[PDB]
Symmetry: D2
Subunit: 312 residues, 4 copies
């Protein structure tokens, strides 16, 4: 199995990504680390604990990371994930899954420096603040990581701005750090995740798993669906598990190696992932961008993970 | 017929656009105005005169405009259009078509203020310097123009930069002026013109027109083809007549009304046409962007214009 | 005498500059051209006509120029010059001084191309829009002008922003055009004009000229004084005649030749005149920046001009 | 005495600042932390060890921090501090002063969280990378610090660029983090430190201390002098001890409370400390900028520290 660290900001689709990573046997989930983004750090961390309580995730540390972007002001997304960050779910008075005492940045560094070289894939699905901080605090992690597979970016059409995707937009400086390090980066951007639609058939399949964790996922996906239908005129785009799915089986999506850099100073374009598709593409390009999704394979992976989790 | 002013920087595809505008009976070509861009102003103006000499264009003033962009340094494209701006053609010792004494900006203003309101379409196919200058020198032209239909811009993939198209890139400030005036603007960008391919069948049809102007077009298109095949790994994209074709018959391409603005200060993205496709689109949007080309109709229009010009 | 074109946006200190240029025998005032800035173009043009009516200026064309900056939105300064642009003065039902039929940009070009080379100094005391437009529409004026002496800019402390001075701030693109042309430019910036204080002794000297034009100047300077005392905690800074004064007698101020460029894209610094005082200064630098004012000589020039105008 | 952490990049004037902090009895020097800047991190850290060996500094941890700026590329200053970072001094085969095992960022956080609140002043005299990293990794340090007194910035004239000072220029993002946190910041910028001249009388006083550490300081100051005389046409500006001197005795310099922010995106002005001196100044402004130096008091403090260190 592939060892990963899942760095996230749950977040309704982050929650699905946690359960895909936990339920799929090709993934060894070493840690869930949280970052400010969809909601404040306090809220997304509580949300990660709720997901772990729901699915019975034991032995996987949950560590809270950065509560602010590197440079820019905090921006949250309650219009998409709700004031709580998980729609209309309710919370227990106390969580079974306790928080790790280590800052996420410290846990990321410790895991990378103590595991064998080239064995851990970083899977960020929120802003890149923790990843950037870790890379600058312990530069030896950059060559030691297997690769980075992140949900974020967009070649053309944004969501947080006309041209920028939310995870990059909320911390462009951190994204610039990650994309300009020498490690291999796979950008699973909106071009790809716009295809990860929670169609009625998908929601029906989740309902038919017939477990409490699947009921939980269906509940938050039904909230997420109403927001996307109302605010965006589409079915809900379940972005973040696409990054975990690539690690499970890269044939779940096509990719193209192209140069990618992060715009920091544009008036209209700050937070854009600027991609260069012009001919010729440079050789030994360390960045690749995802393009076409195997829709059936993707949702089969999500459903299979929910089936394997069962009713803990 | 629709009256137009064709503002251009010939330029191999500009030359095709001149002949489409001249040969098609739905266009009343009022003037050919030139601007620095593909080559220096002196060269592109001589090239416009050569095209007029080749096709026997009489009674249409050719006026030279701005020799520098508004703010940024002159950038030419000899790697695409040759050191002369028209590939390997030869020039007569003297042109039959003489240059108008008026600066292009003055001719544009004079034509718009003397013709009936809402009767003239501006068709820019180079940098937007002359159009911007005219709008600022005589602001009354903005409401008097029928509309602006320009070749330029790109929603996603650029040519002059990863994300910017040449005509916008060479004078972003002038583009910002044009796109932020109240007149209707149709942006016939690279998304559209990347489909205007000079395939072998197209070049064969040009050869079979069997006229000296068609031979001229075939010659410059064969140069243009070798440059695109070598530098870009595609057939040649014959961009500029797409803007004239829209004026002839808007059903030759689909369009979408979306907000468009011009990035001026990005490190990576200066010169980008930033388009906002997010839902919901604003009402009464004064900009629209072209999307899908009717390939057969487009090339039929070009071939028909060459047939109608005949051998003058 | 030195021929000048005074390009301005009256504007209380512009009005003083008009009368200094008109009254001083070392200046041959060829034209008053107006630009949007302190107020709308309509208002500052009416204000120029009022100044000409008050002082009996005959045979000097007043031509209205650009009503918008090149790229950025119109910004006016009614908090400094009043809703009318001249404080609380009243206007006649009809002006004696009629407006020239030519756009200011056309008049500037015509004057420069018809007078002997190197004989006319351009003296801008508003935004640089007209000057930039003229330079781009007829590039031959750049080498034909004697030099440009402008009121604008600041090495350190701004007024319109922390670091930018108003005339540059309201059209940074036009300033960038002017400062990057090859002509000699003298920047009479806030470092200098902050010393041009209308102290009680100065206002007393204006009162003692005992003419109707001096009464007019005293009236607008008393408004200007109340605004500066209230909003800025200083006496009024009478900036614009400093540029005319340099043309009369360059020993009225010290200058330093240093590179100067215009910031266009900074979030905080757009509109800054970026000056490079670091050692070593380049040779044959075409820009110089004013530093120390001969306070007594400056106000003696203003008072002498008012005395020479007398009561027309 | 005032507890400080001296964060620095020795650096010839940093070396003087270390000895002022060590020798003056009003300072309790808790740590010397190093950052990339004047030279690579490896070199400036070795240089800090050499200074500690020369002056016999025991019981003060030296901890190496960040080897790269947050976002931008490494920039060093061998033209000012030499290829080694300390001019032409020689190095022992082994240092007596050993390096702390903790990263500087970890040591800064540990010291602030373990000492009483509001007892430690941070004194950065290099790029602000470590300070910014510490503030983001443990946000509780921001309210716990007494204040930040840094050498960096400039109101008007820069050194690394026309308008930017080196320490801000080499990591503008880190500076933006520091200046936009709620802690009190005193900016001891070039306006102030340009007055800290190593005149012949100053160098003579250093020579007359007649100790090996003073000989060391004289040697590096003589190199520093030759660089400033040759490259800058001034005596050497000994910047960094000015920040320590303010902590010893704030009356050694005047200050003004004014808003200060950091320009990140300007083409010409990135790295500028943008100061707002316009009237009125906001109340309870958390930033102040140094202005006039008590030259005699400043150099008396430096000489007295060298005398107190003696010959260890
Ligand atoms: O732009 C998509 C990203 O933004 C969030 O709303 C989602 O969790 C996802 O990571
Ligand atoms: O980017 C396409 C544009 O650039 C030029 O090379 C062509 O003439 C066309 O107008
Ligand atoms: O910044 C000074 C400039 O701004 C205007 O208010 C004055 O007329 C002057 O030209
Ligand atoms: O700009 C002055 C700063 O730059 C360095 O050269 C000095 O050590 C000082 O900290
Ligand atoms: Ca997420
Ligand atoms: Ca063209
Ligand atoms: Ca003015
Ligand atoms: Ca230093």
């Amino acid at each position: 199995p592939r060892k990963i660290i899942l760095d996230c900001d749950p977040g309704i689709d982050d929650a699905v990504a946690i359960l895909l990573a936990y339920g799929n046997p090709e993934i060894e989930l070493l840690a869930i680390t949280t970052v400010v983004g969809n909601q404040t750090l306090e809220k997304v961390t509580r949300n990660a604990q709720l997901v772990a309580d729901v699915a019975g995730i034991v032995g996987v540390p949950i560590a809270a990371g950065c509560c602010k972007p590197l440079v820019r002001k905090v921006r949250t997304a309650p219009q998409i994930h709700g004031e709580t960050g998980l729609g209309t779910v309710s919370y227990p008075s106390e969580f079974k899954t306790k928080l790790d005492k280590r800052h996420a940045v410290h846990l990321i560094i410790e895991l990378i420096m103590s595991h064998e070289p080239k064995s851990i894939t970083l899977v960020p699905t929120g802003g890149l603040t923790n990843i950037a901080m870790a890379a600058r605090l312990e530069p030896r992690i950059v060559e030691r990581v297997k690769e980075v597979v992140l949900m974020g970016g967009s070649c053309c059409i944004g969501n947080a701005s006309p041209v920028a995707e939310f995870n990059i937009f909320v911390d462009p400086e951190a994204a610039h750090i990650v994309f300009n390090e020498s490690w291999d980066v796979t950008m699973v951007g909106l071009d790809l995740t716009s295809q990860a639609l929670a169609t009625p058939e998908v929601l029906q399949r989740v309902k038919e798993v017939r477990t409490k964790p699947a009921d939980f996922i269906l509940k938050i996906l039904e909230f997420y669906t109403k927001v996307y239908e109302t605010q965006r005129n589409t079915y809900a785009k379940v972005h973040d598990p696409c990054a975990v799915a690539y690690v499970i089986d890269p044939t779940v999506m096509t990719t193209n190696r192209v140069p990618v850099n992060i715009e920091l100073n544009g008036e209209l374009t700050a937070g854009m992932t600027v991609t260069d598709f012009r001919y010729p593409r440079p050789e030994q390009c360390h960045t690749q961008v995802a393009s076409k999704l195997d829709f059936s394979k993707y949702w089969d992976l999500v459903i299979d993970a929910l089936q394997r989790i069962g009713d803990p």
